[PDB]
Symmetry: C5
Subunit: 270 residues, 5 copies
């Protein structure tokens, strides 16, 4: 980031001394039209940055749903079938594996470490077999439910109550998948990314005729404004991906595991 | 790149502007940058709001197609958990659900669904479906039959029937949504007026920029016009989300992803 | 397009501006561009927000009308799947559902339903409907008794009676949605302040632009007029979306579509 | 219209500016338009956003009332379809539903409900309802009694008791909605700060404009002041949409339509 | 708070008035035109960023709305479905009310053991406190009262679910506030805009001084107030659960919820 700040000082220091030689040549740059170009570029940046934040908000929200759906899915099992702790333990395995599996999915990293830690090596094979493991896990979770229904422990009515929670989970898998694959640029945020770049360097060549030796000091401030806002938006265009923060996605998979363990009394120590 | 016509009609409107600056004061015409800043800022505000509407629309498209994937996934899944016996009923419903996705992509693209419909369904059904003045919506009706019969046959209760019915509702809203998108363009008025005044402005600009820049006019009267046109194209770039080229939604891609996800779920 | 009345009343105002510029420094009226530059930008900002708030009402109007097709489509579908036999009820229900679309088009346009209502229904009904304070609400109450009877008859169970009820809810939300949009104008004075102010700014702008551009004034003032004036009517056409203008919602097309859809092959299904 | 009380202050501020312009160098006060351009623009951006946030509150108000009408009609229609016999329950319920609408109107407007409540309810109820510090919550609670009775009568199944329960939910959210809107004002800073800045900016402006415009200052300076002052009172009017102003919500109108609607549905 | 900032700006104006004498004899110009540009840009960005903070504050205030609505109707469902079972009434209302109070605490990073022991037996208070999310646990315990009523045939699976859903709704509120709290907006939306509005505000006098001479301090302090007000109006609404006076009144909100849930269950506050 700081690289484009200092190509500017160079461009200013150039524009100061090279301001001499088009004295005789008749090619001038006022500030009046660059101020127009700038006020424009800043409107578009403000609108664009706005869409990026909205993209980030949807990711935060989607993940919060994982926590809620999983918490209330486990709560329904305890409230409805308070005895079936072998089932409780199994379903809580699948939910926790889904969180971890999804975080690994959006990050394009390996899930095998977290999966074997959580599920039997038949299942870990069936899940790593599938092209859609996160979906696969939800399918397996759904079996432990539908089985308690064959077994008669769940009625169609109380089966339905829990199924709606696997729905909430399924909309999240799709929800994040769509956020991740979709480039909100369509590589067209590479247009704005560069138009800001051009304007930001042509700026001293228009500012120098007003500010003399001040040109670098003011031409970098305007640049650090315009470049921050752009890169701060390009960041939130990809909120799971490589250009993102992992502390929340990891603290989130950790909280849900902690919450699900505490909810089935595997914590505290006996 | 119908854009790169007025990008270089500009350089030619910058040179008509340079060599005919001389005559200006004698004709009594002056072009100052001050009102073109006013105009351009008012255009740029309007362009900004208008792009926003267009992006919201593209998003809404990407979203609806996203829901086909969710609703059909969970619908297969519900069928597995609730009737794990009935793989006859599984492969039937899965083929309608796959057919729906493909029949919708065609309809939105105005292409012929008969190929895929026959790959996926018995000729009886392909006939039934294509008879309809609304075949995608019909495919849904046929999928709901397999569900309904299963209920008639006692295998689904009213409750579990309801659980799967709501998945056909989600799909039924995806159809209405795409139909509405493919037929309600952002009023031709919004797109015609803006596209007009952005053009008129971008070509009167070098006449007003010349007093301040002398020969520097093209290298800047273009850089300004690219910014105001790139932004008006990018809005027309996303007003056809169901097209078959460039930035338009990869409906063919998505349709496969659906078919693969859905066979993966049923061991095929 | 009474816009072109004033697009030219402005040319006659640019003209008054030019044949009074050479009594200027005599009458002592210094008049510059930079405060009208402020006035323009302030108006554009408020025109930008106002026009966006209009498109939203239009968008919402369009969406509600979409919901009619969806709710009515799957309402038919549920009858064809749950009571596939009862085609005498199928037709009774479809008849009402299409009365709804036409009736609501009339309600929102303030035209006489009686034509359409008779084309579609028995006359004992056409009277009872036209008898009612809210007719569209009454059509909806008749569609309910159709469902309600089938439930009493025992053909529909409580569950599957409920499944269809929700769809009449979906439609009662579309009713109130369009009343709210129609009977609620954009709060008053929003139009008077924002429409008074843009005319006035359009006809004073040449008086202060003439000093800078000289003759170019009618060209540049009419340009700025077409920009600020088309945008103010564009926002006004959208305020009323159930209107009869060409930019309004095509409600007769939409009701036809609904009708062709619910009678795909004369209400006949696979 | 204390805007016109404010607008004339500006025109006397303008004559003041004109007469006291000459002694400017004699005092050393240079005032250009350019920094007021920056400032005034910034005010417009903030006003734009601020005003926008208000129209939201107003719209949300409107929609909550919109749902009262929807929720109460379908609650009535569900009774006329599930229990077309039991008219004793229809009267008791429609009376309770229409009481709710009126109890809420009076609640939001801070007015005595006892007129409309007595007019629609028995006296053992009206005393116990006004007894409550939450009378509209109480009406809803009594409205659920009738439903729950019918279910314990066996005239409603749990399933059809369910279907109607969900409209009481719908109405219970409308309560909370309006209650939240009325108590929660937009942070008492958005309307306070911006009214200061607009007011003060309007006053100083002719002192920056007069150097340029001279005797013209009153005209240009009172125009610019009108634009800003008007766009600022719009957002003030919407701050409380449940008031009595001509530009607030017609709640008396709204509540009669609800009472005619539910009465025409019951043949009364 | 920002009243020192205004003052420091005056000093910077006064510094700039005295220091204008050495200007071109030190090699500098400063036009107003470039700062109108940068200044407008900052206003646009502040305009959007402010808009995002109002949204968080609206949603915080909104989620707390749903706490009341959900609990009021979970109570109404009990009364109307099981009017007899008034022991279930009191016990459920005690967890629902304790849920509110613990959520207030959770958000505020303060200790609920007081409010908890007021409301619930100690077997519960210890059980609740052992949890890494006591509000979750409280929901679990209010879930059993509903659940055991279903095992005793007093609630069918249908009417159980009716009330279960309100429990689900509350769980959404909980996850929602937890999400509004643990996620601040990208912290860059502060260091960027706070630096930039500050830096712009203390150099504006240096550039206005040519145009306005002595007039520089007033105009410069007006423009600085307008930018600095609109800046911090977004900082307040960034922790809407905090204890600042503009933050949400969670204690009043929490009482209205108790008052509401008692007024429904015969007992009088
Ligand atoms: Cl366990
Ligand atoms: Cl357990
Ligand atoms: Cl199969
Ligand atoms: Cl009656
Ligand atoms: Cl609720
Ligand atoms: Cl009746
Ligand atoms: Zn949920
Ligand atoms: Zn357990
Ligand atoms: Zn733990
Ligand atoms: Zn779903
Ligand atoms: Zn199978
Ligand atoms: Zn295309
Ligand atoms: Zn639907
Ligand atoms: Zn039929
Ligand atoms: Zn409803
Ligand atoms: Zn001239
Ligand atoms: Zn002339
Ligand atoms: Zn009746
Ligand atoms: Zn009687
Ligand atoms: Zn009284
Ligand atoms: Zn609720
Ligand atoms: Zn009780």
């Amino acid at each position: 980031i700081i690289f484009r700040l200092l190509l500017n000082v160079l461009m200013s220091i150039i524009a100061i001394i090279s301001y001499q030689w088009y004295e005789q040549l008749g090619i001038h740059l006022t500030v009046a039209p660059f101020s127009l170009l700038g006020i424009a570029i800043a409107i578009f940046l403000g609108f664009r940055n706005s869409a990026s934040y909205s993209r980030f908000v949807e990711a935060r929200n989607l993940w919060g749903t994982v926590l809620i759906a999983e918490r209330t899915l486990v709560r329904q099992l305890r409230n409805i079938l308070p005895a079936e702790h072998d089932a409780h333990r199994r379903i809580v395995s699948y939910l926790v594996a889904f969180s971890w599996s999804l975080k690994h999915q959006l990050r394009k990293t390996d899930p095998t470490a977290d999966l074997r830690r959580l599920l039997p090596e038949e299942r870990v094979t069936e899940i790593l077999a599938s092209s859609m493991p996160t979906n696969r896990i939800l399918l397996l979770a759904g079996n432990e439910i539908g089985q308690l229904r064959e077994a008669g422990k769940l009625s169609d009515i109380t089966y339905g109550l829990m199924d709606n929670k696997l729905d909430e989970l399924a909309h999240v898998l799709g929800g994040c998948e769509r956020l991740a694959t979709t480039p909100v640029p369509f590589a067209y945020t590479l247009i704005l990314q560069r138009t800001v770049y051009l304007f930001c360097t042509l700026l001293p060549f228009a500012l120098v005729g007003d500010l003399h030796y001040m040109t670098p000091f003011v031409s970098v401030f305007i640049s650090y404004t315009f470049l921050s806002w752009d890169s701060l938006a390009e960041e939130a265009e990809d909120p799971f991906g490589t250009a993102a923060n992992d502390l929340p996605l990891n603290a989130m998979c950790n909280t849900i595991e902690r919450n699900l363990l505490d909810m089935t009394g595997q914590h505290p120590l006996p």
